[PDB]
């Protein structure tokens, strides 16, 4: 069968993983014990206790230690969980050059072992953060290794991108740019979600006044579930990982689709609602409901894909799309007339006990590339330029096996990217 | 992993350290006998950092106690928590530094250093993986300045790749306690600038302010002042010792806090700073805590913050809270105090959320600020020193111990260099 | 006297290289060097450069404990470098160092490989680390100055005999 | 029936024996009492009791005294347990020339008696240590005697070889070389395991942080059990002792196969595993899982043999082997294309109460010759050359009936051996 | 088997021996009456080595007590453990050697030797198999040097094939106790070099160091110093007397410890050396013990180890431990002391693990080092002696007893020969 690999890297990655593996279990019907075709994300072990086809890495052992004591514990392999000595401490030069070129080889081992299991290895999913220390260098390093090994195989990147406003870490801007330098030339596709937009979505649509990391994470995780379920499940028009790559990336360099899961609806909002197919389409195209801090109207939807789930009938979908094409406001790029692929899966999303969402019969993750993400790029280039004028925190990185020139080249790359998007828009 | 080697030098260092250990003990469930009687599993999850356990669940700090006199460290022993310290830790001579830098560094303390370094070496090899060295040492005394500084130098030669952090208690110009306080501070700083990664500068003046105004203790015991600093250091290191939603390593803090090699000096705070029965007019919230922290009354440094702009900020919160709330709260803060946040660096603040409260406050926080304003502290001491050097005053005590006028001139140069750099990045 | 002036013209031709050594001493920045050294393992180029500084200082490479694989103890010059750099007055010590007081052993080590190496050449070091520019320049200029002391100093002494 | 003889020589030999006879009993179903076709390793007594077909020799009575009081005590018939007056004290010249040429004749007697029992005497197994005093000379002496007696019969040698790093005894290097001089020209086959590699295996794969001699020994013993079970049990493709000799010795001089037992899997590592046939093949070929401190990639596997046990089906095995041949990394010799024999035995390994391993349904002892063992030879030649430059500990040996010239000739032999391996590699 | 014949000569020999016997008694469960009241079967498993049993469970040490005076050996009798000896074993005259080598060897002790040798002959014939002779005899006295040395010579003539080991208490240059200490030592050594297989050189200086610093006894009783040496000898001989994971015979130790015929002198140590309640701060581990042993403060010899390099080392541990741990631990140690381990010999250390603790310490260890540094001890005495010989000092006492200047010159030659050989193998 078509079968996959999970790689959670950095604290962010692992936390998302904690949420992810909860969801899959609840869907496939697996208990935390591992006891009960899920082939894609569970490799049914000899003894049984179907165990995830996943990898869990962090230099900060603190994080994965929490994993090892959670109820989600006996689910993961002993092998699954890998530890490092000391954390990357928001240095890209520690993630890549120092502590990376130590524990990476052990990780490559576990990967290779897992690779051997897969009859039909589809590809990879790499949960990291452009702007953690771990996920900024280490991720890039890992990617590089895997490209050398496999090359042809599918690679996906759920990247927690810096929120232009929201603040976590001072050097955050440097990390993203170094990641981009290296990532864009490996990962064939990169779905990037920033926390601020998710927070917006948490407050408004779910009426939640205290958005915890957990809740934000469950939302992030349901975006993937939809991307997968085409692999994981039956149904008309089933999509593959390769299909996204192919469909959504007319130009090989530009592969940064935004995501957006609707409906994002609480226990109340279930009633005062009927959740029709076409309702949910409109919701997805909403400027506010985007999972990035980007307004889609400030460019053109280059390519779109929509992954309807549960009780969705294609005729319903086709009409909604007609409507969408009709609206002149919502612009699309010149080169392609029909910029949709529709995948309808008989499996509905099943929602996590003690969570945000209620039973939505129909749902849709729209993964839509637009030239409008060039706004979030520019912002971050600017943040970096400002601090690299001063050459601040230059000392940390340099002394850790880095090049000052690497910083300059990274910007150059960003300029090129931005230029490309401009061309496409024209 | 990532264990820390504590040090206490001089009466001041020794006493803050005394209270510091007592504090953390209570946080990790350890009683006076070195036995664990805590109900929180998380305490012993990472007891490592701060305690080496032996036969029969004896728990012992990784702390070295240094005093050129026996007396203050013998009081330690008599004390309630003193028994948890080892004789191996209690390393003393019987000649007092008597508030002479030259006695501490060159003469009396050079005789007692090698013995101390042996204990340092014992304590380094007993580490699963040494992270850093915390030195609580006064700047203005004899055993803190000279002996402390000498200890720092040799330790940095031995372990250069590791963290050296020093909660150094500095002169307060308005409440001078000693004769050559200027001399001690200036000679100490000259060395410190070059020998540490991060130094938390705490003056007694500010502590008094806190006690008098906010805690409403109009009889401050050195105990109370100490209790303050103790909690500050606990907060700094909470992340390493407990799981978190975002976890800040000591190196992480340093890396996030430091624009340049040199300007590593900080001002810690704490919140909630309230008197007993002055908490019922209050209600513990993220905004509350932030407001308290960013107020001048809750700064444990000389400088008024508003006489300058924070270069960087790192607010390491504790207890169970919404990252969103903290994010959103400290975004407002960035905006309001536009004048008192440096332009160079966007996302001036860096928020780290430990998931552990400090055993009796439902929420808590700990500030670390790097303000250009702290140049004023250095100015005051530079001025005080300079005037007395103009009369070559008290010279005979130092020339007697081998020290030279040129050294003092060079120490003045160091001070001048520190203040100019802050001015540049105002 | 004209012969003396000629050796003093030799010095004037050599004065820029002496000035280059002086400029290298100057290019020792305040605390960028201090921090690149504080960090454990900077670009190998700069690790070569500080090793070169170690040789310049005359401090010897130590022996890393031999790995299981190799009976021979690994030759490590970075640990000496670590302690040498660690000195508070290390930058001051570089400023204090004398061209005349240079081991010919150091020139043998450095000129041959380190002086004509492309990575050791300033341009690559300019890339490698801004702080290291000074250090590389220092090593190169110091070697040139000991090339220069070796050639001009005995000549100047011979000139003194003529005088 | 095909029936065998055990000879445990030296402290090492006897300790291994203590472990060995435990295992066999647990497998054949014999109690320590001797009460209950095991013909090969148990000779049935008059009634009920079964007696091990073994010889137990040590000059150090201390060792076998422990045997005589253990629960494994009444299992043996004290015809077997032979004692000497004083220990060889890590002198080869005491093992061979002095205390050897005294008690050897008594041992030859017990051997002969045991030989008479065997209808079909298959051959011998000689647990000794290249680098104990007993097993270095005495073993050689014993071997010589048996060669003179039988000649045609099968002789096997489980030799605890010196770990290049790990330290037991100062003269250790001399002993090995003298043993080699004499052993290689008698024993038709010699499976050599060093302790360090076994320790590596203990730490990594079983997660055991305290590798005792007992545990290391059980592992060593299970390697034999597999070698035997083809004799001891039914099944497809059954191998004989003579078969190894024939298989593993293309050149009559070179016969030093490495061993490696997989799976080496704890109580945990049971789950989150699939124990498949082909999984376990890969594991065996692993550079780390070798029972010697040798990297197999630093030469070529010349001839290999694999002794699968339990629920192994040949088709599974044949495919794994195809895969293995495919991998170009794992180098083979040019001139022999198919360098495997496969023996599949319906008996699975049964694991010792209070031990390392859990219930592994499938297991495989790969006994593989490589030219890569020439690295461990060289090392030891060097250790010896270094000490024999100084002529150190020369006095002990000489005064005990030895030749200085014997030391020189031994090296010459080693040079020849090494040269031969080089030729083979070419 | 392998029984040892103890000897005690001179007040010093007699007193250490006194305490030595008491020590072993407790280790083997024997009370003051010569009755066994121990709960460990292992004690009486090999009681042989050190005791003769007679009628009614008699327990008699195979120890001969020699004193040229009656007094010290009459104190022995009065003592608590004194009455365990068979009174026929105290052989005394009534003329004191009075710290004259010539009185001990030539004159007074030549009269009393034959009687002693008869008792020696009794003991040898009462042995199942005699292993060795332990002589506790001071170097610097009268009854230890002359009488002791004479005893050694004749015994070696009688039993040349056997072990002669002497825990000889040597002069400390810094704490001289006697007049002609130099004379006594030099004449003794000359003979000892040629008459013994191994000599454990223990000076009072080092004992004091241990007591004062580590055991924190600032009132050393000769009792305490003796208790120290006693435990040292027990440790040496533990292996013979108890079962072990690796067992070191006396000959084994000698053979492992001695590069050349002559350089048989050693420095013993012990660990854990801690004060009461001081132990507390320690926690008993293999690393702990090794670190203690290899520290200069826990050496019972004059020489600082670091003023030279250990030629060989033999660490005979006690109690229940992981051979792996010891192996791995003492490999690190080899690496750490790169400069204080001689190159000639790889695997400088030799680890022997007795399976018996010393009845009250869960773990323990006993060091034996052969250091080039001990040349310094010989130098000091050579110097002291040489100067006094320059003035032909105290000559009359010796010439009076038949001794000659040429003898002294030859004794000087012996000393010179000893120091040059160490220099060569530095
Ligand atoms: N969604 C989500 N994002 C997180 C979480 N924790 C951190 N992040 C994001 O990750 C970045 C902060 O760095 P981390 O990811 O924690 O760092 P790391 O990758 O663990 O690197 P080190 O801390 O140096 O080991 C920012 O983009 C944060 O918003 C979390 O639990 N959920
Ligand atoms: N696997 C294993 N190896 C051991 C054991 N004891 C000793 N060895 C090895 O044997 C060698 C040490 O000498 P021993 O085998 O004890 O000596 P011996 O053959 O009894 O000779 P003598 O002690 O002189 O009687 C080294 O290779 C040790 O690692 C044990 O219990 N298990
Ligand atoms: N915060 C605090 N400061 C103290 C304490 N004891 C003394 N100090 C300060 O230490 C300074 C003098 O240095 P000190 O270390 O006592 O000199 P030493 O005894 O020679 O090391 C004074 O400015 C005191 O205010 C204390 O318990 N807490
Ligand atoms: N360790 C130890 N040394 C002793 C003891 N009694 C005496 N000595 C030493 O023995 C040395 C003198 O020799 P001694 O044997 O008394 O002379 P003798 O009485 O004529 O044999 C001195 O250096 C003392 O330090 C003792 O009980 N323990
Ligand atoms: Mg992290
Ligand atoms: Mg033995």
Numbering used by the authors:
A (entry chain A), D (entry chain C): 1 to 36, 48 to 437
B (entry chain B), E (entry chain D): 1 to 426
C (entry chain X): 70 to 232
Q: What did the authors write?
A:
The dynein family is a group of minus-end directed microtubule motors. All dynein family members share a common architecture, based around a heavy chain that contains a cargo-binding tail region and a force-generating motor domain. Dyneins bind to microtubules via a small microtubule-binding domain (MTBD) consisting of six short helices (H1-H6). Nucleotide-dependent conformational changes are transmitted to the MTBD through the stalk to modulate its affinity for microtubules, allowing dynein to bind and release as it steps along the microtubule.
